[PDB]
Amino acid sequence: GKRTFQPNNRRRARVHGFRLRMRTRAGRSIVSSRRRKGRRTL
Amino acid sequence: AVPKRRKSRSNTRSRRSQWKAAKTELVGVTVAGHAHKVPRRLLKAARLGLIDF
Amino acid sequence: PKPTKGPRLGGSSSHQKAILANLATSLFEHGRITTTEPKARALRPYAEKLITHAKKGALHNRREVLKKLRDKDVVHTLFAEIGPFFADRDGGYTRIIKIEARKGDNAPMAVIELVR
Amino acid sequence: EYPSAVAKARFVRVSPRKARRVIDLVRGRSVSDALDILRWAPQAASGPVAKVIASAAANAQNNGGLDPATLVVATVYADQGPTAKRIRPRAQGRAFRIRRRTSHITVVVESRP
RNA sequence: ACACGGGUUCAAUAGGUCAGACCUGGAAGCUCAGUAAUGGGUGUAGGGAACUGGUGCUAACCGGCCGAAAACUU
RNA sequence: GGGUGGGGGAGUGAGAAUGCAGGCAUGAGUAGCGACAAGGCAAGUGAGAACCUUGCCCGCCGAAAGACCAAGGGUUCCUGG
RNA sequence: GGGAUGAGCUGUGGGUAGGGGUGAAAGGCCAAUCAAACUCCGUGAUAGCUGGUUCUCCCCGAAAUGCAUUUAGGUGCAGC
RNA sequence: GAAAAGUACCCCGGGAGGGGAGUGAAAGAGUACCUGAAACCGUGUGCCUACAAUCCGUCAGAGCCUCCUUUUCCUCUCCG
């Protein structure tokens, strides 16, 4: 019962991976914002 | 329970100053060679050579 | 020996017992133990009594001591050399000398050794 | 009148008030007896100070050409040194600050026949 | 804690030893009865904490520090 | 890098907004120092050791305080310093 | 202390996403917060209420009263 | 600091750090370094304080201590 977060990188990639960002029009606009700010992306 | 106010500089220094170490020593301490001084409590050990500086 | 007022050494009295037995073992096997002063004080009458039984010398004395010291080699030494050697003395077989303190706990250290 | 010699140590990893507690024992005392006191100080924090006083003896005797047997601690300082800080976690996410205080110790010795 | 009380080798305050008081209740070994479990003798035993009284056997250190040197009237 | 004087122009005068950033204080050398398994001794290393090392005792879990995989961590392993 | 072969517990991989989801329903749970989650944008939002507004000198010097108010803890005209 | 000229060497010290020499116009320019404020800690020192209650001051105000002019005077006086 007492937990908070149980990491799993495969799941993180399939859910938060930029590949999934590419899947949508909305996700692409997110990425392009990150490029201008100058950050390393997911 | 908390300090409602700062203790004045005077009283804080009085309490701080009531925090000291004791002074104990002995002279005339004869050991092999130089008469190194020790405390009375460890004098017997000094006579037996059970100290090191 | 006499009970001790206040806290027992280390943990409970069982631990105190084990401590006194092992220190006594070391003492008989070396002749000079450097430890804490309280433990040396507690250690005196215990070893003093054990030596008294060695001085007398007997089977039931061996049983009595073996109730306390599981190691036998020190008993051989005790009932072969030490006891008989201290036969010409009526009590007071140990000596305690004050030792310089330990940097880390300011322990009033002391060394306990046999008179000879 | 009193051609003193000076020795000091910087960036010592010892708390100021603890140093003060030690050095209050040696004001106006002779060098050899003061060092004996510090050797037998139960505070177990007099070491560095004794080292500093030793440096006073070395400078006073060799650089100045004075007799160690006559040296007296004219004055001693427990100056507040550069304090650093490191954070410590406590309950309920409280982020407290534990400090690492240092000091600078200055010793002045002089011949007082 | 500190303080207080007594003593500090012309000494018995502490520890030990020995002998007692007191508590426990009959040690091991040996021997005897019994196939055994166990019971008797050696033995009011053996062991032992404070208490009592002797015994200078070890430790109280062949030693340090602080502590008066006084203005006149009546 | 600034004074005297006539003029122009202001992010212009801090004593408080349970204000903000930095630094330093009182509380205070107080509390706390992290399971009710337990350490001890000798020798040695060392300027220095109750906490490291080597020996010997003691004590503790032992369907877990043992030994292996995944996930995860991503050099934390070893040697030397 | 209760259940502990059952409406069971658990890991792995997957889906449901905001005036919407889920719910053996309590209006709790949805990244420590839920009678409508989080970040950003419009945003320098708003507030008849609170709180703060930095140096000085010289002269002069109020009211807490009326009228009206989706108004009486505000504002407007008048009075000073 | 214009320049690294980065305190060789020697002495304490386990080292760090420091000192004496020395460079530099300067070390009051030592990597923790232009000027180095305040709060703050600390050493030394003149004065007050252990029979006394008041936002912790002001005004009266004794007697000590630092400094200083005139002056009897020290005439040692062409010195102070």
Resolution in A: 4.0
Alpha-carbon distance of D38 to D59, in angstroms, equals 20
**Hey, is the C-beta of C103 within 8 angstroms of any chain D C-beta?**
yes
- Other CB atoms within 10 A of residue A22 CB: 11
Phi, psi of C75 (to 5 degrees): -70, -40
In DSSP terms, which residues pair with C35 in a beta bridge? C110
Residue D4 and residue D71 in contact, taking contact as beta carbons nearer than 8 Å: no
Q: Which residues in D31-64 are b (16+ Cβ under 10 Å) and which e?
A: beebbbbbbbbeeebbebbbebbebbbebbbeee
Spatial neighbors of D47 by CB under 8 A, at least 6 apart, are: D38
Residue D19 and residue D107 in contact, taking contact as beta carbons nearer than 8 Å: no
Query: What residue spans define the domains of chain B?
Result: 1-53
**Hey, is the C-beta of B52 within 8 angstroms of any chain D C-beta?**
no
Which residue, chain included where needed, has tokens 């301490």?
Answer: B29
Give Dmax over CA atoms of chain B in angstroms. 61
Angle between helices D47-58 and D16-23 (to 10 degrees): 60
Residue numbers in A 2-41, CB below 7 Å of strand G: 4-6, 8, 10-11, 14-15
CA dihedral D14, D18, D21, D23 (to 10 degrees): 10
- Other CB atoms within 10 A of residue D96 CB: 8
Q: Which fold has domain D1-113?
A: Ribosomal Protein L22; Chain A (3.90.470)
**Hey, is the C-beta of B35 within 8 angstroms of any chain C C-beta?**
no
Alpha-carbon distance of A37 to D57, in angstroms, equals 64
Which residue, chain included where needed, has tokens 């003193």?
Answer: D4
For residue C95, what are the domain limits?
1-116
- CATH code where residue C41 lies: 3.90.1030.10
Nearest CB partner across the interface for D40, out of B16, B20, B38? B38
* Nearest alpha carbon to residue B17 among D76, D17, D103: D17
Per this entry, what is the length of chain A?
42
C1’ H52 / CA B3, Å? 26
| DSSP class per residue in D1-66 | ----EEEEEEEESS-HHHHHHHHTT-TT-BHHHHHHHHHT-TTS--HHHHHHHHHHHHIIIIIS--
The structure's method of determination equals cryo-EM
